[PDB]
Amino acid sequence: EPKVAELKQKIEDTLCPFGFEVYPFQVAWYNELLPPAFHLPLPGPTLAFLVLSTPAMFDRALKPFLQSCHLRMLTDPVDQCVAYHLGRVRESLPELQIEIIADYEVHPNRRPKILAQTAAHVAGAAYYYQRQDVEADPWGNQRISGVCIHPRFGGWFAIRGVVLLPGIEVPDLPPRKPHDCVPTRADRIALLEGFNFHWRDWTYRDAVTPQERYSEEQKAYFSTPPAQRLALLG
């Protein structure tokens, strides 16, 4: 009966060379915090892995993918690339039943209504900073969206997927809280204001100083309209 550390290693062998990181969690840690509409429809002890992309994903996974025979038109290339690598995870664990979010062999709802930031938080991957994390906040009526912050990459990363392993239950998997790397009220205010009110501004992503950022080319790619992205960057 497979151990989490052995599975984690096999998934990392598959994904880490392509700029991803993977974090295990129990389905229960996620569901516990949410209304049933957003639950994962599985037994609490079920093992899951939260998958993130780091700044390296662009050079190691996306650019190669864009030059490959796998690329199709009419759907987002990043989504295609991610689905491809999550597909490779399935292949690398042929003896196991593996579900993936998002599953592109399912089209309608209900694909589950996953709240990705909450998954990243309970998996210890990135602290999900929300309005509630600022006491007596100054924003009144506005819609202040929260944002996850990675201790190594700040906001220079993205949550990309979840790998589920139904039938593999890890009731004694020990939880680890995400690193509270933006601990002070003033910094949390600056983070959330940068995120919700600052334009052509990547600055909220430095709320903790990152060790590495998206390259200028990657920044260009994500801030260029889709019609022009591939042409402009060749």
From Swiss-Prot:
GO terms for biological process: cobalamin metabolic process; demethylation; glutathione metabolic process. Its main location: cytoplasm. Can utilize both FAD and FMN. Changing residue 160 to Q: In MAHCC; results in decreased stability and reduced stabilization induced by cobalamin binding; has reduced affinity for cyanocobalamin and reduced activity in dealkylation of methylcobalamin. One of its GO terms (molecular function) is demethylase activity. GO terms for cellular component: cytoplasm; cytosol. Its EC number is 2.5.1.151, 1.16.1.6. The keyword Transport does not apply. Substrate binds at residues 103, 114-117, 128-130, 148, 159. Keywords: Cobalamin, Cobalt, Cytoplasm, Disease variant, FAD, Flavoprotein, FMN, NADP, Oxidoreductase, Phosphoprotein, Transferase. Changing residue 121 to A: Reduced affinity for cyanocobalamin. Monomer in the absence of bound substrate. Homodimer; dimerization is triggered by binding to FMN or adenosylcobalamin. Interacts with LMBRD1 and ABCD4; the interaction ensures the transport of cobalamin from the lysosome to the cytoplasm. Forms a multiprotein complex with MMADHC, MTR and MTRR; the interaction with MTR could modulate MMACHC-dependent processing of cobalamin. Heterodimer with MMADHC; the interaction might play a role in the regulation of the balance between AdoCbl and MeCbl synthesis. Belongs to the MMACHC family. This is Cyanocobalamin reductase / alkylcobalamin dealkylase. It comes from Homo sapiens. The lineage of its organism: Eukaryota, Metazoa, Chordata, Craniata, Vertebrata. The gene is MMACHC. The chain holds residues 2 to 235 of 282 of the full protein.
